């Protein structure tokens, strides 16, 4: 029941996979992607005193993790090291697959004591915490993150102009704090017209003998940057759609029992194939929307 | 090779994807569901002395885990805390994703000392141990379970009443023990003519920002309950089918190398699609059941 958007001539139209998607060409799984847009582009306050108020502690709900493929540059990122008054830790250690959020401008590292009344720290507004192509609902200890939401969409069939290399390195500074007592229409306060994205590119990154993991780039050299500013209606439409799709995603995560979910788009593709050529589709009937000759 | 049963007009028939299912309308993956039925509904003895004799220890076989999506209310559940004579534990600690079986009327806590020949404890009759929508072949320490088997079904097309909310209150009692020296026709001793089931939430279960995990129900307030006493042949046929499918599931779990298997029904759907629309079929050919008019 997770909504997904279809892009046509740089125009975004939301429609579920059921809704007669045959005039919209879906040829391969390369057209399905998920984008991790962050909240700071919606006009929310980003300083530490006001950002802290959006996170609270809750005991009794297991954490969940969702994979996302493309992201956005973040001006502000956070890194928590909260401890209990008696010296005990509050935040769980990050699992092995979790890494810090790439492409951060500033990293606000927060340290100090506070009352920790739960097992995990959740987002009071329902958003996610993004850690390097893995969105999570809880805060892990000592890993850089940026709060945001993730949206699913179907790309047009082309040379992959979307999420390419600079259509039209970086320095992250240290800011330390000490604390005690711790057609879709855009309708957000503000929307950022420019989308400065980063993404990982399957294949096409091996020259000489650089595909060997030994003679290869480190974990921070994989990403391919870009920039998209020509159209601003599509960008704010994507942001609004990303805000809307959070409810269906949170409930789906609550229902499932898998620790990390990597198979939403594959399930959508299987659903599409089963809806369309499921059985005994008629030539004249609009349900089997094919053409004669 | 795992058998699956299809339901039409409250009748159960066993078939497979390779057998031509054309009237059997498979349009979406929502019709593919797996249910785990308790082993006590077949008339087996449930008291501790008799139930203990069905579990034995073995070393040299790795454990395997498979999921199920719908369960059944259990009259008797068990919780083992045994240990070796020298004080060392016999049962491994439960993994992170494993939780106790929900909806248990009674819980028998068994604790004591006894010989522990093998690494893990298996079921001598080949059945599974059910852990909150995760069926395992071994017993984990201090976790409530209930013996049962798993069956795979194809629900009737878009009827929405199967596994619903009360089609036509939870109190658990703990009893403590101490031990020392530790088409389908029903063909079981007895079959229960009522099926009081529980299932995970049908996604949408949130009204007043209850979808936020912070402002959300705990891990025990998720499930939806119902009751299906109307039919007698259907559910006893279901019990017998779940009895039969264990051999194939166990062999498949032996063959695979995944720790937890979540992708059986998806593979079945892929097989069905690749079979009936494989390619180069004929209008008059019966391989692809297509109706010209």
């Amino acid at each position, epitope marked *: 029941s997770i909504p997904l958007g279809v892009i046509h001539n740089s125009t975004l139209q*939301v429609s579920d996979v059921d809704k007669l998607v045959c005039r919209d060409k879906l040829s391969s799984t390369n057209q399905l992607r998920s984008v991790g847009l962050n909240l700071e582009g919606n006009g929310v306050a980003t300083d530490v005193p006001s950002a802290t108020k959006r996170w609270g502690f809750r005991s009794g709900v297991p954490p969940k993790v969702v994979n996302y493929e493309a992201g956005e540059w973040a001006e502000n990122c956070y890194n928590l090291e909260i401890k209990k008054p008696d010296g005990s830790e509050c935040l769980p250690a990050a699992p092995d697959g979790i890494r810090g959020f790439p492409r951060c401008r500033y990293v606000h590292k927060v340290s100090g004591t506070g009352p920790c009344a739960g097992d995990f720290a959740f987002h009071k507004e329902g958003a996610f915490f993004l850690y390097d192509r893995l969105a999570s609902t809880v805060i892990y200890r000592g890993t850089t993150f940026a709060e945001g939401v993730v949206a699913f969409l179907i790309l047009p069939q082309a040379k992959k102009d979307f999420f390419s290399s600079h259509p039209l390195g970086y320095y992250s500074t240290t800011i330390r704090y000490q604390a005690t007592g711790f057609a879709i229409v855009n*309708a957000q*306060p503000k929307c950022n017209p420019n989308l400065h994205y980063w993404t990982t590119q399957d294949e096409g990154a091996a020259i000489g003998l650089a595909w060997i993991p030994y003679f290869g780039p480190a974990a921070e050299g994989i990403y391919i940057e870009g920039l998209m500013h020509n159209q601003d209606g599509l960008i704010c439409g994507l942001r609004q759609l990303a805000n*809307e799709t959070t409810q269906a995603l949170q409930l789906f995560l609550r229902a499932t029992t898998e620790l990390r979910t990597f198979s939403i788009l594959n399930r959508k593709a299987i659903d599409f194939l089963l809806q369309r050529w499921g059985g005994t589709c008629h030539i004249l009937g609009p349900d089997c929307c094919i053409e004669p000759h | 090779s795992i058998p699956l049963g299809v339901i039409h007009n409250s009748t159960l028939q066993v078939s497979d994807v390779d057998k031509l299912v054309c009237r059997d309308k498979l349009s979406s993956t929502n019709q593919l569901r797996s249910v785990g039925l308790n082993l006590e509904g077949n008339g087996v003895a449930t008291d501790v002395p008799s139930a203990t004799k069905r579990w034995g220890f073995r070393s040299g076989v790795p454990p395997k885990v498979v999921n199920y999506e719908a369960g059944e209310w259990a009259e008797n559940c068990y919780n083992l805390e045994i240990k070796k004579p020298d004080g060392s534990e016999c049962l491994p600690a439960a993994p992170d994703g494993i939780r106790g079986f929900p909806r248990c009327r009674y819980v028998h806590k068994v604790s004591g000392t006894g010989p522990c020949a093998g690494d893990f404890a298996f079921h001598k009759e080949g059945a599974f141990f059910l852990y909150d929508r995760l069926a395992s072949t071994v017993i984990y320490r201090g976790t409530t379970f209930a013996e049962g088997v798993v069956a795979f079904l194809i629900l009737p097309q878009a009827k929405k009443d199967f596994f619903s909310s009360h089609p036509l209150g939870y109190y658990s009692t703990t009893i403590r023990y101490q031990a020392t020296g530790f088409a389908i026709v029903n063909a079981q001793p007895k079959c229960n003519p009522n099926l009081h089931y529980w299932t995970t939430q049908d996604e949408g279960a949130a009204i007043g920002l209850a979808w936020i995990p912070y402002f959300g129900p705990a891990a025990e307030g998720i499930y939806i309950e119902g009751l299906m006493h109307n039919q007698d042949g259907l559910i006893c046929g279901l019990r017998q089918l779940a009895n039969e499918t264990t051999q194939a599931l166990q062999l498949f779990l032996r063959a695979t190398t995944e720790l937890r298997t979540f992708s059986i029904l998806n593979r079945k759907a892929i097989d069905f699609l690749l079979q009936r629309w494989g390619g180069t079929c004929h209008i008059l050919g019966p391989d692809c059941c297509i109706e010209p008019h």
Partner: nanobody
Amino acid sequence: QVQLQESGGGVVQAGGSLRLSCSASGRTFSNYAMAWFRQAPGKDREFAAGINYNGERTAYADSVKGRFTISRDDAKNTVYLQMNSLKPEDTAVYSCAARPWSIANLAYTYDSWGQGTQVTVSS
């Protein structure tokens, strides 16, 4: 929670004006956002207009932008939709929806719904 009750529908000539209303029960009206949905015959439900819990951000669909104005009165627990320069393709069933502080386009994010009223414009 929160029951809704629309009124003011009817039949109007093309190019005329019409105004709808939607009264909400309860006493936490100022904490909710209101939106109007319309359903053309043989078509799905779609978004028309909206407003916050404080009336500082109103969003309109492209089809009705510039012709429809939406306002709310917290002292009477009612919202209004003023319609101007009506066109023959505006004939549909207009529905009233309520949801917690915010503004949304998709219909599945809304808590309370009204039964809707019929608006028919004649050429």
